[PDB]
Design a binder for this molecule. Structure first.
Ligand SMILES: Cc1cn(-c2cc(NC(=O)c3ccc(C)c(Nc4nccc(-c5cccnc5)n4)c3)cc(C(F)(F)F)c2)cn1
Length: 331
């Protein structure tokens, strides 16, 4: 049981074991604050996240539990993994804060390591990690370049932490569809891969409405029947007021690109989420022929999400979270 020191960072009091030094605030939000640090015990650069009031509400406590459970379960080369989890509390009765620790990566996909081969390798790794995540019955929902970390040797890792999420969000989420499926993440991959191919953001909308119009300008406005699978009533009415836009031929948009990459993008960037390619299907596409290895593209061990159906109070989620903290074993 180590010694903690205190330091006021990100408008809050950080209490961390002395092994973590050189704390430097990275960013913050309503769901936590992140610092880069140096772990003197391993010699690693790490990221430390302090969850912001994790037990203020039932949903806060449940998602605190949800994140810790999820992260303790992820064992994949292309998904961020947990190096440590700690609390300064000495007992459940004073348990109020939770800290998570991962590797610090040298870069994200916005800031780059190294061609068509380099786009293939990066997108392959995203899809390899997504196949794993999706096999655990988890949807990322927030994929964007700043959530994709890359080390020196261009090994990529998916995480969840300017660069707007809206630029990469699936249209059915933008149109207020509540019942979307895992391929919302594939839409995001298509937008990311377009930007790696051309150098430019595919749909850099300045606002909610601008985003929809830029999307429809490329894929074409949907018919009424398609609208009812991807959109809520007020969004359907608005889309139906717009001039008809035809689908563009992606070959004239991604001029010069590998024709197999264009074919893959045509399968990713479709409005019909029942027609959109899955991560496992995309990994088998001929575009990735030089890296595709079904024996090295594993699924996840079964992930017990039955807690998602439990109706628990704040103190009950707090209690389960505490037990996940004190049972953690580092890799
Ligand atoms: C409520 C909820 C959360 N999630 C979920 C959480 C994470 N967490 C992290 O990635 C995470 C948690 C703690 C830490 C410390 C970090 N590390 C981190 N965070 C922000 C930035 C950086 C960073 C900064 C600079 C360079 N490299 C990394 N690292 C990640 C990851 C996923 C997924 F799907 F992507 F796997 C899902 C699901 N439901």
């Amino acid at each position: 049981r180590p010694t903690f020191y205190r330091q006021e960072l990100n408008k809050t009091i950080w209490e961390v074991p002395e092994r973590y030094q050189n704390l430097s605030p990275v960013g913050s939000g309503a769901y936590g604050s992140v610092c880069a640090a140096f772990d003197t015990k391993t010699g690693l650069r790490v990221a430390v996240k302090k969850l912001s009031r994790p037990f203020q509400s039932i949903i806060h406590a449940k998602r605190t539990y949800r994140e810790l459970r999820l992260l303790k379960h992820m064992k994949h080369e292309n998904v961020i993994g947990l190096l440590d989890v700690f609390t300064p509390a000495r007992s459940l009765e004073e348990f109020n804060d939770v800290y998570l620790v991962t590797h610090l990566m040298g870069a994200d996909l916005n800031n780059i390591c190294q061609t068509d081969d380099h786009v293939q390798f990066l997108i392959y790794q995203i899809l390899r990690g997504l196949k794993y995540i999706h096999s655990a019955d988890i949807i990322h929902r927030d994929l964007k370049p700043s959530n994709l970390a890359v080390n020196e040797d261009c090994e990529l890792k998916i995480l969840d932490f300017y660069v707007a999420t809206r630029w990469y969000r699936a249209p059915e989420i933008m149109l207020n569809w509540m019942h979307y499926n895992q391929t919302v993440d594939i839409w995001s991959v298509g937008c990311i891969m377009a930007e790696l191919l051309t150098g430019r953001t595919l749909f850099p909308g300045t606002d909610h409405i601008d985003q929809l119009k830029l999307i429809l300008r490329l894929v074409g406005t949907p018919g009424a029947e398609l609208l009812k699978k991807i959109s809520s009533e007020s969004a359907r009415n608005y889309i139906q007021s717009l001039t008809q836009m035809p689908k563009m031929n992606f070959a004239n948009v991604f001029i010069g690109a590998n024709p197999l990459a264009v074919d893959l993008l045509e399968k990713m960037l479709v409005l019909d989420s029942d027609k959109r390619i899955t991560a496992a299907q995309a990994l088998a596409h001929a575009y990735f022929a030089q890296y595709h290895d079904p024996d090295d593209e594993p699924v996840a061990d079964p992930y017990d999400q039955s807690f998602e159906s439990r109706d628990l109070l704040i103190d009950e989620w707090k209690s389960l979270t505490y037990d996940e903290v004190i049972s953690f074993v580092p890799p």
